[PDB]
Design a protein around this ligand. Structure first.
Ligand SMILES: [Ar]
Ligand SMILES: [Ca+2]
Ligand SMILES: [Ca+2]
Ligand SMILES: [Cl-]
Ligand SMILES: [Fe+3]
Ligand SMILES: [Fe+3]
Ligand SMILES: [Fe+3]
Ligand SMILES: [Fe+3]
Lengths: 199, 200
């Protein structure tokens, strides 16, 4: 039946992450841009791995295009604000959740969609936590990305139900929710879009 | 210009024997074609990732990857309409063969990479044109639409190569890749792929 975002997620965005985010918005934009690209890139890797699953390759193709549009929009905004194309490394969050995926099919694909569901759901929750504290152009932009992150969250979770049983998915969501919550609430060395509470 | 017509740019036509083999196994061709649209999209995202501060490359490669993914989806709808089932079809030797000529040191590793892109796109344009007189209306219509967009991708990939390299060093790369591409398109081959040599 698909929970609401706050119901699906193990915790809110800590007040400390947001204080850190607002002090270093150039790093945030670069990392957001990078995350839109990794989403598209991750969707293409699933098409390559599951090359004869027609229901998956169609969704992932459309989703990869959505993510690339977002990747371009964020590059547009970066130019307007003279944010320079500076190399920012990946946070621990994405690699962190994938370490949870089981090695065997057909659970490996279910687990991968659930992790996808969490990343989308957290991005939605976190954009909304930021909007009110931002300028109008950045606030209007991030408010725009909100409805599509919720849709990508619904999409990833629906696709897991297509390829696995209600019971196995409830259990996967439970294990991931906990790992995801620990990543958000733990302290972290670097302000990323999906980083923990800064030391 | 430094951007020729396609037949000028290419070092040979599509052999009639490729076409004979292709018309006998159109379903394998569709599937390989679908995999090629997809691979072109992934290849573009590799270049975004590899050259993460080349702001002109990153913008164009994002736009191209979206274009290639529309083509990927269009090929999937076509296969469905015609009851062509998905099944595993391995990559042909062609793009690997070309990638092995790419020099290992920047800034020519990039230039070389984009010239290879210009040859893949040019060949596809040429081969689509060679095929469509032989196909049914729907398939011919689809491949005619694709041929227009390959031409652009070939132009784009060559202009981008000029944006990042010396005119004389491009010409010497084009000349080298041209010869190997021809060798790959003209030599015999175990398998039918969109860019296979002459099957056996
Ligand atoms: Ar075909
Ligand atoms: Ca909650
Ligand atoms: Ca500055
Ligand atoms: Cl698009
Ligand atoms: Fe997005
Ligand atoms: Fe998304
Ligand atoms: Fe294409
Ligand atoms: Fe193309």
């Amino acid at each position: 039946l698909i929970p609401e975002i706050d119901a699906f997620l193990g915790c809110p965005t800590p007040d400390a992450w947001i204080e850190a985010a607002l002090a270093d918005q150039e790093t945030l934009l670069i990392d957001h841009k990078n995350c839109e690209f990794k989403a598209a890139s991750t969707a293409l890797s699933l098409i390559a791995k599951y090359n004869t699953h027609l229901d998956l390759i169609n969704m992932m193709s459309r989703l990869a295009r959505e993510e690339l549009v977002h990747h371009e929009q964020v590059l547009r905004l970066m130019k307007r604000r003279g944010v320079p194309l500076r190399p920012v490394s990946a946070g621990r969050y994405a690699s962190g959740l994938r370490r949870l995926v089981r090695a065997h099919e057909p659970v490996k694909l279910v687990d991968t969609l659930v992790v996808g569901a969490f990343i989308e759901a957290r991005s939605c929750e976190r954009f909304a936590a930021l909007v009110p504290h931002l300028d109008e152009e950045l606030g209007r932009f991030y408010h725009g990305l909100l409805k599509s992150e919720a849709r990508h969250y619904q999409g990833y979770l629906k696709l897991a139900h297509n390829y696995g049983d209600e019971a196995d998915i409830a259990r996967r969501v439970e294990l991931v929710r906990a790992a995801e919550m620990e990543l958000i609430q733990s302290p972290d060395q670097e302000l990323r879009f999906h980083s923990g509470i800064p030391q």
